């Protein structure tokens, strides 16, 4: 009756040095912090910065190869992003200006690939803006996903809105990680943990009325990032 993970695997990407878009600063520190925390929780973590489209697709293929039945998979992305028709896209550092969906990675496609590996848990922490891309002509018509009841999204912000870091950030985390880092070690279902983070963020004066954590979850079982890995000693 303690839920267990077959393994715990994470991919973390922070994109900052954009060639054709405004540069960001905080993804480095955000990625560094979440790497440390997830290693404390016994994840195998790949953590990568300033990825071109090609490097992003390679990194997710490598991450996919580490997933299998019952494995807890987590993806964290800090950098530019957008959202068209409910699909979220991550923008690589070599994106042209303007750019379309074909220059970017679609998070929903990654989730489909993860479900094909029969993971026990799928977590996406998307620390990026979610406004429309006007130049993106195209339409999804993606296939419906299976009902696996094990999917949690923690979006740094709401659809059509922006996610933030502190101007000339230096050492400061972006807003999402500022609050996430103080709760991530808790031994609570990831859904509930993210809900507490949503509440903490709501006390932040800088972002009132412009950024709010959105949780989207179909996770039915009481799964947590602290769950022990099967066959080790807890």
């Amino acid at each position: 009756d303690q839920p267990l993970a077959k393994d715990k695997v994470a991919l973390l990407i922070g994109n900052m040095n954009y060639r054709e878009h405004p540069k960001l600063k905080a993804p480095l520190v955000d990625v560094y912090e979440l790497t440390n925390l997830l290693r404390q929780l016994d994840f195998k973590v790949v953590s990568l910065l300033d990825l071109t489209e090609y490097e992003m697709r390679n990194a997710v293929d490598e991450f996919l190869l580490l997933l299998d039945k019952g494995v807890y998979g987590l993806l964290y992305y800090a950098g530019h992003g957008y959202e068209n028709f409910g699909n979220s896209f991550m923008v690589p550092v070599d994106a042209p200006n303007p750019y379309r969906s074909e220059n970017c990675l679609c998070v929903q496609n990654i989730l489909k690939l993860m479900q094909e590996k029969e993971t026990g848990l799928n977590v996406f922490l998307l620390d990026m803006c979610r406004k429309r891309n006007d130049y993106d002509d195209t339409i999804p018509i993606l296939d419906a996903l299976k009902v696996t009841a094990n999917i949690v999204f923690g979006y740094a912000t709401c659809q059509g809105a922006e996610a933030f870091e502190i101007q000339h950030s230096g050492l400061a985390n972006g807003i999402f990680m500022k609050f996430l880092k103080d709760r991530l070690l808790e031994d609570k279902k990831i859904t509930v943990l993210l809900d507490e983070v949503a509440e903490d963020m709501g006390k932040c004066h800088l972002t009132k009325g412009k950024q709010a954590l959105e949780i989207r979850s179909s996770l039915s079982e009481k799964r947590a990032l602290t769950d022990p890995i099967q066959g080790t000693e807890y």
């Binding site: 405004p22 960001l24 600063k25 800090a78 950098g79 530019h80 992003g81 620390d127 990026m128 803006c129 740094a156 922006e162 996610a163 933030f164 870091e165 502190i166 101007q167 950030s169 972006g174 807003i175 800088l206 972002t207 412009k210 950024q211």
Partner: peptide, 4 residues
């Protein structure tokens, strides 16, 4: 703030 700076947006992402």
């Amino acid at each position: 703030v700076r947006p992402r």
